[PDB]
Each structure stands twice: as C-alpha cells, then as structure tokens.
Amino acid sequence: ARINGPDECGRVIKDTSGSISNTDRQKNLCTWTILMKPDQKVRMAIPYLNLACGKEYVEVFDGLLSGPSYGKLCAGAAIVFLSTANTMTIKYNRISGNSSSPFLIYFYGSSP
C-alpha cells in the first residue's frame, strides 16, 4: 500500500508491492528495508527525483545497510533497481534543514 515515509523510518516493510512517499517533512535520516519472500527479488523505481543536491541524497543498498551500495543520488527520472536477493534498503539523508524534497518510491516483488 502507500507508506508514509516519515512514519516508517527504521522499520522493515513486508508488502508485496506498494509505494513510499518521502514527503516534504522527512527526518534528517530515514531508512526503509524492504523484505520479500525468500524466493523473490525486489524491484524498485523512482519516477522523478530532484533533491537539493549538496544537502540531500538517497542511497540504495543491495540487501541490508551493510550490503553493496548502488550509490548516492540526488536527481533523475525512471531510476530503477533490482536486488540480488529478497531484501533491499533505501536510505534518505539530509545534511541540515527542516524541509524535505518530496519523491515517490514504487516497489514490488519479482519472482523469476
């Protein structure tokens, strides 16, 4: 379903599909780990990202936070990611500030 970003920071989302909205009122640090059935891989996409580069960034990890990083990003369109296993972590971080740049994250389980 539709997850409200700020409410779920630090938690593991178990939905087979849904969307995470960042909101313009996000914490300075927020992490979401998506957990799928062991036979699945997670597919994630951000239709449009335009963060105040230099202040904010989003980073995706293949697995948990200790897993390989896909890199920090701040802008883009049709950004897509595929994990190698049934787990994926997304981290929003803002160096100083009160407001957040809003964005949506879509996700679903891809069972080959």
């Binding site: 597919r43 449009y48 049709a78 809003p102 949506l104 879509y106």
Partner: protein, 109 residues
C-alpha cells in the same frame, strides 16, 4: 508488477514488460493510469535485430499517432497519457530478442 504476456491493457504504478516468448509475432500493450497523472515510459539499452524486429510507441490506442519505431537506443524516454500503447513486432521465423520496457505513473508524492 512484471508482465510476460503478449499485450493487454495494463494498469500499474510501476510495470516491467519482458520478452513475450510465445508464437505470436506482434504484441500490443495499452497502458492505463489515473488520468490525473501522466505515464513515463522507459526503454533503456534496447538491442533488437534491426530489420527483423522493432518496438513502436503510439500516442494512444492502436491506429493512433506513431511516435517512433526502434531496434536500438541507449535510452528512450517518453511521457504520455493513459491509453498510450507500446507495440512489439517481429518477422515470422525470427526468435524474439530480449527486451524490457518500463512504465511508471509519473508523480512526486
């Protein structure tokens, strides 16, 4: 979600269309979205056998204005409205090459 069928009317916030491997040589997917939003179609790193197959993007239902036909392209990005169609066609006797088309509801929140 992931789709592997030969065409259809799809409604999804984030969908990934993969190579249909069945006997049909032409597949047409009509993408729907809540009309309040626009669709973002992405066909990254396309590599088909030019001359034997192609992906075509239409403004609306089949028979509508064709926006383009391609077989290779590092990145093709399109923003359209609900009802937009993606079409894949190949010659009889030519096995479909691997492709991946992504459509997303374009939104920021």
């Amino acid at each position: 979600l992931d789709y592997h069928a030969c065409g259809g009317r799809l409604t999804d916030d984030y969908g990934t269309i993969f190579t249909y491997k069945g006997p049909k040589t032409e597949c047409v997917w009509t993408l729907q979205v809540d009309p309040k939003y626009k669709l973002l179609v992405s066909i990254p790193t396309l590599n088909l056998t030019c001359g034997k197959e192609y992906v075509e993007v239409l403004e609306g239902a089949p028979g509508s204005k064709s926006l383009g036909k391609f077989c290779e392209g590092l990145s093709i990005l399109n923003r359209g409205s609900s009802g937009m169609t993606v079409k894949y066609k190949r010659d009889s006797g030519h096995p479909a090459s691997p492709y991946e088309i992504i459509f997303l509801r374009d939104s920021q929140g």
